[PDB]
Amino acid sequence: DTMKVINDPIHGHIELHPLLVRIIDTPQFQRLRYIKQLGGGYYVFPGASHNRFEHSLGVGYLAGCLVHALGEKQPELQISERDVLCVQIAGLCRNLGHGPFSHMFDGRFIPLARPEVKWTHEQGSVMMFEHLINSNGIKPVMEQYGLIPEEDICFIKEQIVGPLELWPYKGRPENKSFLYEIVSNKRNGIDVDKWDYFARDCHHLGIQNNFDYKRFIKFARVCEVDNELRICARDKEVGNLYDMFHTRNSLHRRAYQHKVGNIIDTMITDAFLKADDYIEITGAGGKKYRISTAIDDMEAYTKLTDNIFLEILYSTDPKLKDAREILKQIEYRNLFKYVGETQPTGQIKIKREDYESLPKEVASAKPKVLLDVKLKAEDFIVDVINMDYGMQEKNPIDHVSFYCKTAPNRAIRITKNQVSQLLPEKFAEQLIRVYCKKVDRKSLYAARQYFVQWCADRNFTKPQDGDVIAPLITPQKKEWN
Amino acid sequence: DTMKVINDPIHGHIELHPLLVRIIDTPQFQRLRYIKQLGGGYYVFPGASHNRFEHSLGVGYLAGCLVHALGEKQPELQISERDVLCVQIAGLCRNLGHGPFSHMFDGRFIPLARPEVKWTHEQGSVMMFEHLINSNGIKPVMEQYGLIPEEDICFIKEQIVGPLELWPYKGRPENKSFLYEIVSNKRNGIDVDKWDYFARDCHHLGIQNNFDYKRFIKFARVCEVDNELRICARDKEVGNLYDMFHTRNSLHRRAYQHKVGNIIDTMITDAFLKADDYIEITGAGGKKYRISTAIDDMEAYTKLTDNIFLEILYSTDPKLKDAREILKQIEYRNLFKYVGETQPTGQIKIKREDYESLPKEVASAKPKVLLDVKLKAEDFIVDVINMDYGMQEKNPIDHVSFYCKTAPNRAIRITKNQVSQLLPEKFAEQLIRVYCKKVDRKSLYAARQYFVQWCADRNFTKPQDGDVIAPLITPQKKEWN
Amino acid sequence: DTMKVINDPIHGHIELHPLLVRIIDTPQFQRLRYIKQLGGGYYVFPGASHNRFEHSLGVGYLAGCLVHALGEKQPELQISERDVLCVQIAGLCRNLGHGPFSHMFDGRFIPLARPEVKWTHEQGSVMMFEHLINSNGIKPVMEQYGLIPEEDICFIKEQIVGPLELWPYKGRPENKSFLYEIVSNKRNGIDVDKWDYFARDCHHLGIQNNFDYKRFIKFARVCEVDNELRICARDKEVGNLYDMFHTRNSLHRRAYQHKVGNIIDTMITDAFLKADDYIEITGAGGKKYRISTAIDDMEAYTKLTDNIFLEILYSTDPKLKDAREILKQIEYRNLFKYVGETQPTGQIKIKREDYESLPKEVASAKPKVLLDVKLKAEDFIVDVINMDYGMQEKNPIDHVSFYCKTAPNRAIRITKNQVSQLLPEKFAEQLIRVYCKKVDRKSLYAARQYFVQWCADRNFTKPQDGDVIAPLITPQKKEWN
Amino acid sequence: DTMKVINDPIHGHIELHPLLVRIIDTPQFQRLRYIKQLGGGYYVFPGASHNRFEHSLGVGYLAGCLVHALGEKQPELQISERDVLCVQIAGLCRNLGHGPFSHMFDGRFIPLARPEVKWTHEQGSVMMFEHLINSNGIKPVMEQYGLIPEEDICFIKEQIVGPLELWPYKGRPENKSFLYEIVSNKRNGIDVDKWDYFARDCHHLGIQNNFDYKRFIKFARVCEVDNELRICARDKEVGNLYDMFHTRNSLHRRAYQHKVGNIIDTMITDAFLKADDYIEITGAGGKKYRISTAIDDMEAYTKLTDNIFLEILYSTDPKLKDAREILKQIEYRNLFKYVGETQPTGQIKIKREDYESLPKEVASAKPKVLLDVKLKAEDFIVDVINMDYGMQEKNPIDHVSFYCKTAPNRAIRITKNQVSQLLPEKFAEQLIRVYCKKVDRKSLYAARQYFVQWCADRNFTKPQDGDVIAPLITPQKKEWN
């Protein structure tokens, strides 16, 4: 077995080590060819056809790039080829746990079908990785290339999900702590996964990317920080880092949280909910599973991809009809109609226990305008979106270590006031989108009245089209003026 | 209703007329989201995830661009909004008839599964267009926006497939002959479909395009040629046109006819053949169909996409195991192994009646070298590829009309010697690829001996790696070295 | 005379009207081929070789694009071909007044060599436009193409510089008010000039921006506001607009205000000043002019370009050597050394009256570290840069008119709290860079001590490398520690 | 001191070794900022503003990339950091010898001003390199970083011009022969200089590049052929190589030999000739030199750039008026008029001794058209352009060594017949362009009659617009029809 070269539109010609090749050429990895990166985003951005497979390749590639650069500019770190391979494998495999339409599955479907469980694509990734290793006899191949499976498999899993349960990792000691900052950076969110999806998503969406990850890699070092060895960025690049998160936020505003893309995610999820009792995926031994239970058997999960959509679509079985028509309403583009967007004011925050109580509030909303058709709770959809810099209310740049030209291994910290005052004052907010599931002209009018009224009463922000869509309501007392 | 804007990575923001939108928002059109543009090419070029849907949008857009530009520079052509709409619709819909993995279906599967019948993706497109119109009540929508359904549907179909069988067209008179040169150009192959897949395939493959379609549009005029009004290119642009076809040829050499991509198309095709008796697709009124017979009922064809692959992959049914097994060997990357490439010499040409006659020919030849293994007809695959400039042995530029700066309304002709002596001397050739279905080291050695000997016996060209893979055979051949 | 087609790397093939062609082919316009867009920026970003010529072509092109799009979507605006031509000419010619190395000249040189006069590149553009027209007989050509010279020339000049003297314009009436918002938008700064230099500068710098001007153009309308017809943007596009200005700020941080690029602009300016008594430039009747006084005669200004640099570089006369030597220290890369950066912390701002008093203060700070050299003001350079959103402390988006999907003809306003809470709270700030003109190790050490001490004494922000370059000074103030 | 990072739009962030930096920061190298890569090309393609400086940086970068890659895939070659540095330096410096407007200077001006001499930009590069070394005291710097000035300077010069005169090189032994194939490949022309100008010129022209140099680097090896060590390409990449030269030819057709670009080069050259008596350039020790004699003293040549153009343009000395007005006729776009293009037929070729007799041949021709204006020899320009694949009549791919995957280290040859039948049959041809120095309508008409008649008389190819520009002449010739 020899090295393979693969041509990627984003990174160009990528070299894949034979071990990476044997990991890639498995049913568990090839599965990612049938899972769309941005899910329902494709039904809004027609270029967004790319899948988790190529993304995974890109993440592995960039992980290798960064670890290799660090290794070559600072030999005293003793980064081994074994380290490089493990970091590449973690990069390659940290998307293994995604389900149909990616985030829709873990962010929308599973929380509704099985509110029981705490499931994330990360855990799915460790489980699926274990399953890949075991089902494909990769351990002797790992050994063949100088890896020690019991130490290194642990290292990889820890890279993907963090500590498997004050140095909490058992795959690598603290003098190699920086190796844990590459694939999934739990301390500030700056990792190679973001870099690849910036470049790739922008390539396919038709939006252009302004973050230069190659530059970051060029300016990256390893420093001592509180007796740990961590990745330090050159000081003057701090601005770029802010821009990075700005970029992330922008991509969420323009594409990932697109109103119609989101309502399509919602409709698809709902169809999955109405199909969850009649669609079956056969797992280990021959035992049978459903969409919501596929996550409990990795052999079953292996056969759970975007294909389920088409299965629901092409079915003839009557028991699936409630599902099958929903998808068809997507095909005819008869979608739930968008009513508007608003935000909480002051210190008010929307808790996740109170979401189901939100359409019903809107349905209750006070009249004021002459009434026609009247809509109920089930006719309204309320979607709450949390926009942040990846670390709740916190500024992630406060958790970045920097170095100076004068003393390149002396780590320093940089506060927001040392960079710019045009920077954000907050790093978290919520957006509330309201849609109406009945689509005729005056049901839409009514829904608009209900919505604007509801915004006024909870003292939310004034809807941008407020003066137009509800001229009789927005005049009501005037701190919307 | 009103205009829609769509963001395409290739063309930017595209405006879609409400009628185009109503055509697009049908299951017949949306079907194309599930058919890969380059089919098995995706399994070699990981960026090639794009589907026929986005390509179709692009072709429709470019058709609109060209017809509009011609109309705007030459008002005396009297191009109507109606004409523009018909050309856009034809552009949008000329890909409707493609089947699973695109060219794999009409180029490989159907010819083996249904050798009696005459099937093309063009005819499929016409049929599917008819079915779309009728199933979705598009005629009244057409009338609503100023179209005359009985002439215009004819016009559109003729744009897609040509004269339905003097002036052979019934959709438009001869003074608008140029309108038939835009979407599918039967006269020289220069059309907007090519331009779009040049740009899009290059965007996704990671290979770059050197053809400037925008420049061509800028320099395009309509002039009179043989009592018709046809599209003429500015004289000095003739070089670009040659480059265009060179580009096409190049794209086939690098990507579309990639050895491994083709072998994967072949394996998928074989799997489809071995699954064709057990896979059922529900058509009109409930009648059931097979993969090879789905093309006879458009309601069934509507649900025949790339999905069929995954069905075969995910099945449990024992009657499908021989099919399913082939697919799984694709997942494990256990592919038929490439033995070599060669070409006929002189005037010898291989017709499709002789294709089935080729493995038996390769196995019968025997080289003066001691072997080990002996191979049969079934162990060989022989793939014949016709590389040309789109008009077989002809020079397509001999079928292009040009105009000069001094007299922009006078069409002229340009010969190859008036352009360059560095141009191709022939415009068609055939490539012969040979693969072996046994993958062990020694079946492979044997297969290489059989292959090089066979090349010698038919006086084909010397395989490029000839001296290395068969050192005992290549000197005994003096029409080489 | 016919349309000319020109190939630009940014916009592709652009069509130039014969009148535009006649304006371009004059020494006054062709002059711009010899003035670099980013000046000394080229000495930091080696790709930034582009000149004001190609930029001007781009601005003219985009001006035409916007006016034409508006005219075609809203025929009721009565936009004439004459209007389109005047807007194109204004776009083409608003950069005519730039001097050697662009913004270095009017922003740094003229304020120092001739502090008496109020000079801008805008006024220079009006003057040079007049000179182009009169010196090249363009008025009869204008009439030849349906323009009315004395109203339209007025219109063009007003587009470039604003009102020449309530409706303040005499070139066009209020029902054509929107035409004044295209080439140079004095009301919120959103114009096609920005759009071209974003794309072009990014193309050459090798840094990239995410602003889509084509999308904006697609969503642009004309609405009635107070008493005029002004350009309206679609409501939901407001986010993009914020991003636009963010982009601009980013572009200033990364490239236009690069510490070294700025110090090189400073050195070139000083050389020009020390040369400002011996270089002589031929004027109107033979009268002779010099670099600072060339702006008083357009015939002389026509011959004032970047060339002056090389002339000073290649000269032999001793009265020029203090100049010629400065330039050579640029060639040997013996530049003034960068000492550090800081900012004010309250609401009082370093006024432009206090700049000359800033180096002396740096000399005034007493650092209690033992030094070996001590420096006075001449060895320090203090550069103060105003970073804003183009409208002082104000939010330019507060000056943008929007429209809604439901009522495209009703202009509305959108406030910051209505978009996001992650936006900037102020829209203006200042950067303070300090350099040292003596470059040996000990003057640099000393200068850093002086600088950090000066930061301490004035309660400015902590230099990012503060603890590293001056560890003995920095503990003195508990809020850095 | 230390490494610098520089951001290039083509290659991204490039690392510069301190020695390279000290070579770059000299007047001899910085000189290249003022010499346009494509000369008069900028006056046709407005994006083509880039200079020889950034191109040189790109060539050094790619030279480094290739030598590094070879060193890392095959350690047994014993490539040292010293080798890498010497190759990078040669890459950086092989453009030092270009004069004003690049190829205009050595291709047009010098051959006319001094037909005597054997001058090339290569020899200029060696002389200027010597002058840089000596004038800037870089030898102790070379020694400081482990280079041996006598052998290494020899090596670099040999890389630029070839053997300074068995094994003809004395800079490096035969086991390092492959190192001579990187910067200037005298054996087949495949070198990094080409790769960089493909990418950069395409970036700036608005033409897109279709050669993948990174791919080539990935598939490049060193093999033994004729007891020498040469760079080998992977066999299956041979098609790409043909495409490479095709690309080159294409770039010459579209941009480098553009009719108007070439005529502008011609006019600038004539201006240089008529100025050749009055501009004075001070050389070594106050000795003074001419534009045509600057090449004999490197101190003078150092101060000979594109600036010369502007000097002539801005001059007031009456003795320069003949030059000065010519340049002005460029500014007003009053150019020599393009009459037409033709080529020799059969195997007859035009020698350079016969170039001077060709306008007289055109003026002597008698066309049977009624004329009143008739033109003489001095009114015609005949430009003969040699288009080839870089090796005169030879196929350069016949001089490329290949390897097969089965024996990656055994060199082989591949003939044209083993690749395609669609390839060029000849690899050299000539283009003959005719221009007229009188630009009026009737002189242009006359010039066209003379030209087509001259083509008929020499049995050249029929001009593409022949039937249009000279309808009374072209029927006379029945090898035209």
Ligand SMILES: Nc1ncnc2c1ncn2[C@H]1C[C@H](O)[C@@H](COP(=O)(O)OP(=O)(O)OP(=O)(O)O)O1
């Ligand atoms: N001419 C080409 N230009 C650009 N990319 C190419 C070209 N040919 C193939 N590719 C792409 C497709 C793949 O993603 C990647 C590898 O291609 P390729 O070299 O053909 O691998 P291969 O496995 O088929 O050949 P082999 O096993 O004989 O080395 O490069």
Ligand SMILES: Nc1ncnc2c1ncn2[C@H]1C[C@H](O)[C@@H](COP(=O)(O)OP(=O)(O)OP(=O)(O)O)O1
């Ligand atoms: N901010 C953006 N930048 C670039 N592209 C965008 C942006 N927002 C959306 N797109 C893309 C996605 C779609 O393919 C296309 C349409 O966008 P969009 O304006 O959101 O249509 P829409 O139908 O959702 O809005 P609406 O119906 O209210 O007019 O443009």
Ligand SMILES: Nc1ncnc2c1ncn2[C@H]1C[C@H](O)[C@@H](COP(=O)(O)OP(=O)(O)OP(=O)(O)O)O1
């Ligand atoms: N083959 C090409 N591809 C892309 N751009 C080109 C090509 N040839 C020329 N260009 C560019 C250069 C110019 O900027 C622009 C116009 O060139 P061109 O069409 O040749 O004008 P022209 O004035 O010399 O020809 P003519 O006067 O005969 O119409 O396009």
Ligand SMILES: Nc1ncnc2c1ncn2[C@H]1C[C@H](O)[C@@H](COP(=O)(O)OP(=O)(O)OP(=O)(O)O)O1
């Ligand atoms: N934020 C940026 N993004 C992209 N490119 C940049 C950015 N800043 C600078 N560049 C470019 C300009 C230069 O060509 C190259 C080097 O920039 P830079 O790192 O600022 O050099 P420098 O010499 O000024 O820094 P240093 O302080 O280390 O000496 O990168």
Ligand SMILES: [Mg+2]
């Ligand atoms: Mg391979």
Ligand SMILES: [Mg+2]
């Ligand atoms: Mg919409």
Ligand SMILES: [Mg+2]
């Ligand atoms: Mg022309």
Ligand SMILES: [Mg+2]
């Ligand atoms: Mg530096």
